[PDB]
Design an enzyme around this catalytic site. Structure first.
Site, PDB file in Angstrom:
ATOM      1  N   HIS A   1       0.812  -1.220   0.000  1.00 51.88           N
ATOM      2  CA  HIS A   1       0.000   0.000   0.000  1.00 51.88           C
ATOM      3  C   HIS A   1       0.849   1.276   0.000  1.00 51.88           C
ATOM      4  CE1 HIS A   1       0.394  -0.124   4.523  1.00 51.88           C
ATOM      5  NE2 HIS A   1       0.428   1.185   4.350  1.00 51.88           N
TER       6      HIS A   1
ATOM      7  N   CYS B   1       4.685   1.480   9.114  1.00 51.44           N
ATOM      8  CA  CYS B   1       4.495   0.371   8.187  1.00 51.44           C
ATOM      9  C   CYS B   1       5.820  -0.054   7.569  1.00 51.44           C
ATOM     10  CB  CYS B   1       3.493   0.757   7.111  1.00 51.44           C
ATOM     11  SG  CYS B   1       1.882   0.729   7.838  1.00 51.44           S
TER      12      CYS B   1
ATOM     13  N   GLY C   1       3.501   5.944   9.963  1.00 50.15           N
ATOM     14  CA  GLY C   1       4.846   5.872   9.432  1.00 50.15           C
ATOM     15  C   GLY C   1       5.578   4.594   9.764  1.00 50.15           C
TER      16      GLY C   1
HETATM   17  C1  W0W Z   1       1.455   2.488   7.901  1.00 47.17           C
HETATM   18  O1  W0W Z   1       2.470   3.451   8.210  1.00 47.17           O
HETATM   19  C2  W0W Z   1       0.221   2.665   8.792  1.00 47.17           C
HETATM   20  C3  W0W Z   1       0.541   2.245  10.228  1.00 47.17           C
HETATM   21  C4  W0W Z   1      -0.701   2.357  11.099  1.00 47.17           C
HETATM   22  C5  W0W Z   1      -1.094   3.813  11.337  1.00 47.17           C
HETATM   23  C6  W0W Z   1      -1.210   3.980  12.856  1.00 47.17           C
HETATM   24  N1  W0W Z   1      -0.732   2.733  13.421  1.00 47.17           N
HETATM   25  C7  W0W Z   1      -0.436   1.832  12.486  1.00 47.17           C
HETATM   26  O2  W0W Z   1      -0.019   0.717  12.711  1.00 47.17           O
HETATM   27  N2  W0W Z   1      -0.854   1.821   8.280  1.00 47.17           N
HETATM   28  C8  W0W Z   1      -1.955   2.318   7.703  1.00 47.17           C
HETATM   29  O3  W0W Z   1      -2.196   3.518   7.656  1.00 47.17           O
HETATM   30  C9  W0W Z   1      -2.940   1.346   7.104  1.00 47.17           C
HETATM   31  C10 W0W Z   1      -2.997   1.529   5.577  1.00 47.17           C
HETATM   32  C11 W0W Z   1      -4.389   2.030   5.213  1.00 47.17           C
HETATM   33  C12 W0W Z   1      -5.172   2.139   6.517  1.00 47.17           C
HETATM   34  N3  W0W Z   1      -4.284   1.665   7.595  1.00 47.17           N
HETATM   35  C13 W0W Z   1      -4.562   1.496   8.905  1.00 47.17           C
HETATM   36  O4  W0W Z   1      -3.729   1.162   9.733  1.00 47.17           O
HETATM   37  C14 W0W Z   1      -5.966   1.734   9.383  1.00 47.17           C
HETATM   38  O5  W0W Z   1      -6.264   3.129   9.232  1.00 47.17           O
HETATM   39  C15 W0W Z   1      -6.876   3.833  10.241  1.00 47.17           C
HETATM   40  C16 W0W Z   1      -6.295   3.916  11.511  1.00 47.17           C
HETATM   41  C17 W0W Z   1      -6.945   4.635  12.515  1.00 47.17           C
HETATM   42  C18 W0W Z   1      -8.168   5.260  12.250  1.00 47.17           C
HETATM   43 CL1  W0W Z   1      -9.018   6.189  13.535  1.00 47.17          CL
HETATM   44  C19 W0W Z   1      -8.742   5.171  10.982  1.00 47.17           C
HETATM   45  C20 W0W Z   1      -8.092   4.460   9.980  1.00 47.17           C
HETATM   46  O6  W0W Z   1      -6.840   0.889   8.631  1.00 47.17           O
HETATM   47  C21 W0W Z   1      -8.064   0.481   9.080  1.00 47.17           C
HETATM   48  C22 W0W Z   1      -8.787   1.262   9.978  1.00 47.17           C
HETATM   49  C23 W0W Z   1     -10.031   0.847  10.430  1.00 47.17           C
HETATM   50  C24 W0W Z   1     -10.552  -0.362   9.980  1.00 47.17           C
HETATM   51 CL2  W0W Z   1     -12.164  -0.876  10.579  1.00 47.17          CL
HETATM   52  C25 W0W Z   1      -9.833  -1.147   9.073  1.00 47.17           C
HETATM   53  C26 W0W Z   1      -8.586  -0.724   8.620  1.00 47.17           C
HETATM   54  C27 W0W Z   1      -3.966   0.608   4.818  1.00 47.17           C
HETATM   55  C28 W0W Z   1      -4.775  -0.510   5.487  1.00 47.17           C
HETATM   56  C29 W0W Z   1      -3.842   0.485   3.300  1.00 47.17           C
END
Ligand code: W0W
Ligand code: W0W
EC number: 3.4.19.12
Lengths: 306, 306
Positions: free
Chosen positions: B41, B145, B143
């Site tokens: 991603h 990931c 950040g």
């Molecule tokens: C990568 O750097 C990042 C690390 C996350 C961010 C905060 N802690 C972590 O471990 N990962 C992501 O941003 C991935 C990425 C897109 C969405 N995602 C998520 O972790 C998450 O996004 C959210 C987090 C918190 C809130 Cl309040 C809203 C969204 O993804 C989901 C959130 C909620 C649900 Cl129900 C399902 C997934 C991806 C997955 C491509």
């Protein structure tokens, strides 16, 4: 999100660990530039360590008595000297992995990472606090002497601890890297005891702020309290006094969450008086005190080191 | 003596971390030989990550779209491919710090160390277990990931986890290094939830054995129980079943302490039925389940890695 007892990356320290052998004793040393630092009781034997006279023991020694091994590469000792409770072995090669570093002495209440080592080989890493009684609750087996504790700020390693001994309650004592003990302990096998400990109050409050940042709020309340009325309750749960400096330290955390420091003390007061009642805070059923206000901001903000 | 949640020394992994940037997204990559592994991603934008079609998104990409930075040294991407949920960026330089390594997929119940990273720079290290529901209770901010989880055996790093996402309960999900998710999760921002968790029974018993090795014995008893009568009590405290294999695993610990495995289950039974009643075990007021029988023998015996 999340909150874990987090250590610094240990790479920069791993490259400094070496094995120091003198006769029958083997322990770890710290190789920086062309000096190897290690506990002076490496010169001791079994029968020596009951009441040794280190200055006598050291003049009877020669450089070639010290076997220093950096991995599978030998190290040639060209000089030696005692500094307080540590030994400084001057060797013929400077460590090309020497990081930028400082020798710092920490305060009770402050935390650091420990790289546990055996035979100059790192075993594991974990976070520790210096207790108010100058002990640390480590994890150390025989052979771990000379393992060091440290913090990292940007690219600079501030060494703060070298391991020397285990006390009969299972806690650990050691020195700063200048060889001066933390607390009233000596590198002799005489009767010694830790001294009564207290809970690090400012650290508990920091951890309560980490909990709020992470969505645990059940312990919050509308109450408040004066700094003096809190300290009256702290004294009776064997917590140590909270100062206006500690209030100041907690400022950013108070600003980030919108909970005045004194309001959080009212929460701690009720938690001390009532317990937690089957609830947990950040996956703990106890009030945790080995996270500083700095540790919390570090983890709840994502600062790195390079 | 002592018992700490201990991570592996992170040095060998720190030398593999790099920063991968594609357009507006920055995350961490793992540089081994001449391949950089990172979450797919990274090719996504904000508006993409709600329902992306990664194969479509990737054919629209060129090598020069991927900025790979190893410290302050650029890395030239010469190829790219998708493997499941990870991206493999072939670069023009092999990492001279590449350790001996393996890509392994772990079981729920097993533990590993996580090197948390931001912008290719390591932030901290900590120990995690894979939960029965295939999540991990990590500490991860935006950040992070591409941070990886790992175990070390002698000189070989077995990579087992790469971080992808945080779920709304604050827990974390990710993949093995072949890009296959742990558990029923997808790298899309759709509604997802962790699934109900259980306590890792064999790990609790291991930790009870660590406590005994370290002088905590108040929870022991003369009682015993059959494996089936224990599992009847485990099911109702939402513990997962204990197998004869788990009994076998616990053999050495049972032999070292003189407490038959089934006797320790009788102790766990009473602890589940009565609680701990103001006492603690290894400084915890809860039954800890993120130490495997291997972890306990490691720490209560002092094995290193080289
Ligand atoms: C990568 O750097 C990042 C690390 C996350 C961010 C905060 N802690 C972590 O471990 N990962 C992501 O941003 C991935 C990425 C897109 C969405 N995602 C998520 O972790 C998450 O996004 C959210 C987090 C918190 C809130 Cl309040 C809203 C969204 O993804 C989901 C959130 C909620 C649900 Cl129900 C399902 C997934 C991806 C997955 C491509
Ligand atoms: C160095 O490798 C080693 C590390 C210890 C050993 C186990 N865990 C550790 O942290 N340190 C020592 O062996 C030092 C060394 C001589 C004694 N010592 C002690 O740690 C300790 O020795 C004992 C440990 C356990 C028992 Cl059951 C008995 C002795 O020293 C003391 C023990 C008891 C008291 Cl009251 C005071 C000191 C020294 C200190 C030169």
């Amino acid at each position: 999100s999340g909150f874990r007892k987090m250590a610094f990356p240990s790479g920069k320290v791993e490259g400094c660990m070496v094995q120091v052998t003198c006769g029958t004793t083997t322990l770890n040393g710290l190789w920086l530039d062309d000096v190897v630092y290690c506990p002076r009781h490496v010169i001791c034997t079994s029968e020596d360590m009951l009441n040794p006279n280190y200055e006598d023991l050291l003049i009877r020694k020669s450089n070639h008595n010290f076997l220093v091994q950096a991995g599978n590469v030998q190290l040639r000792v060209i000089g030696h000297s005692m500094q307080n409770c540590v030994l400084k072995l001057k060797v013929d090669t400077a460590n090309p992995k020497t990081p930028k570093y400082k020798f710092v002495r920490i305060q009770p209440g402050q935390t650091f990472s420990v790289l546990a080592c055996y035979n100059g080989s790192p075993s594991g890493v974990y976070q520790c606090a210096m207790r108010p009684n100058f002990t640390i609750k480590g994890s150390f087996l025989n052979g771990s002497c000379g393992s060091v504790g440290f913090n990292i700020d940007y690219d600079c390693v501030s060494f703060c601890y070298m391991h020397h001994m285990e006390l009969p309650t299972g806690v650990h004592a050691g020195t700063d890297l200048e060889g001066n003990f933390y607390g009233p302990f000596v590198d002799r096998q005489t009767a010694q005891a830790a001294g009564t400990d207290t809970t690090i109050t400012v650290n508990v409050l920091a951890w309560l702020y980490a909990a709020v940042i992470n969505g645990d709020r059940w312990f919050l309340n509308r109450f408040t309290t004066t700094l003096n009325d809190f300290n009256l309750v702290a004294m009776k749960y064997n917590y140590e006094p909270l100062t206006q400096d500690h209030v100041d330290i907690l400022g950013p955390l108070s600003a980030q969450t919108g909970i005045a420091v004194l309001d959080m003390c009212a929460s701690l007061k009720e938690l001390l008086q009532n317990g937690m009642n089957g609830r947990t805070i950040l996956g703990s059923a106890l009030l945790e005190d080995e996270f500083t206000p700095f540790d919390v901001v570090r983890q709840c903000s994502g600062v790195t080191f390079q």
